[PDB]
Amino acid sequence: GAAQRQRALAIMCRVYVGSIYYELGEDTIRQAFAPFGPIKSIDMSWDSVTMKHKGFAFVEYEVPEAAQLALEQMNSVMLGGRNIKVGRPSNIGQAQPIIDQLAEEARAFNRIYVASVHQDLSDDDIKSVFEAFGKIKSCTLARDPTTGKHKGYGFIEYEKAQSSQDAVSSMNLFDLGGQYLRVGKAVTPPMPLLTPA
Ligand SMILES: [Cl-]
């Protein structure tokens, strides 16, 4: 129940990155994938006998919506003078029925994911901006546990689905601060580890 959902959520947070220029490093990948959400980890291939990575890496995000946006955007983009391949891990299958269940459950909500939120922007002023598409039920930015500094992303929940669709359409890649917002619909319901019979 709650255990197999956690297993799929963990796979949903990871994105495969292939065709990485041999001279490119972990920081180049970090800067490139950080706009979609804060990076939890970068697992990179290493050929001990040949030196330098084996052209691919696994970027792990904190939330599955970040991985979905980094997949939609970022695939085929040029990095270091080589077009990268962005996909999902090979074992994403035989986990897919739960990924599809989480997607069905997400459709019951009018929740959107927002990344690349400028550090100086707060909760209420992000709420005021996105309130242009309709009445907002909740608007919350993710915070750092130590300092109350937000992590550059959050979730907005709308009363109507039209508002939700309008917001993603009109606000993805919007110039708010020096940063371009990355906005997508949620791919999970709020708190996916619930399964309430
Ligand atoms: Cl501006």
User: Do 141 and 191 fall into the same domain?
Assistant: yes
- CATH number for the domain spanning 154: value is 3.30.70.330
Alpha carbons 43 and 163: distance in angstroms, whole number: 38
Angle (nearest 5°) at CA 182 between 30 and 167: 170
Tell me how far CA of residue 38 lies from CA of 19, 24, 62, 65, 98, in angstroms.
22, 20, 7, 11, 24
Using DSSP bridges, classify how beta strands 14-18 and 57-61 pair: parallel, antiparallel or unpaired.
antiparallel
Chosen domain end from 109, 143, 159: 109
User: Do 78 and 94 fall into the same domain?
Assistant: yes
CA of 118 from ligand 1 middle (Å) equals: 10
CA of 175 from ligand 1 middle (Å) equals: 6
Q: Which residue blocks in 34-173 are alpha helix, DSSP H?
A: 64-72, 96-106, 123-130, 161-171
Q: Which residue blocks in the chain are alpha helix, DSSP H?
A: 2-12, 26-33, 64-72, 96-106, 123-130, 161-171
Give the other-Cβ count within 10 Å of 76's Cβ: 9
User: Do 87 and 131 fall into the same domain?
Assistant: no
Method of determination used here: X-ray
User: Do 135 and 89 fall into the same domain?
Assistant: no
CA of 174 from ligand 1 middle (Å) equals: 10
User: Do 84 and 1 fall into the same domain?
Assistant: yes
CA of 137 from ligand 1 middle (Å) equals: 27
List beta partners, residue 78: 83
Q: Is 79 left (phi over 0), alpha (psi -120 to 50) or beta?
A: beta
Angle (nearest 5°) at CA 134 between 121 and 180: 35
CA of 38 from ligand 1 middle (Å) equals: 22
How many domains does the chain contain in total? 2
User: Do 43 and 90 fall into the same domain?
Assistant: yes
CA of 18 from ligand 1 middle (Å) equals: 33
User: Do 100 and 116 fall into the same domain?
Assistant: no
CA of 60 from ligand 1 middle (Å) equals: 29
Where in the sequence is the domain holding 10, given as residue range(s)? 1-109
User: Do 103 and 122 fall into the same domain?
Assistant: no
User: Do 92 and 6 fall into the same domain?
Assistant: yes
- Resolution of the determined structure in angstroms stands at 2.5
Enter the DSSP assignment of 108: T
CA of 179 from ligand 1 middle (Å) equals: 8
User: Do 164 and 102 fall into the same domain?
Assistant: no
Chosen domain end from 58, 90, 109: 109
CA of 183 from ligand 1 middle (Å) equals: 17
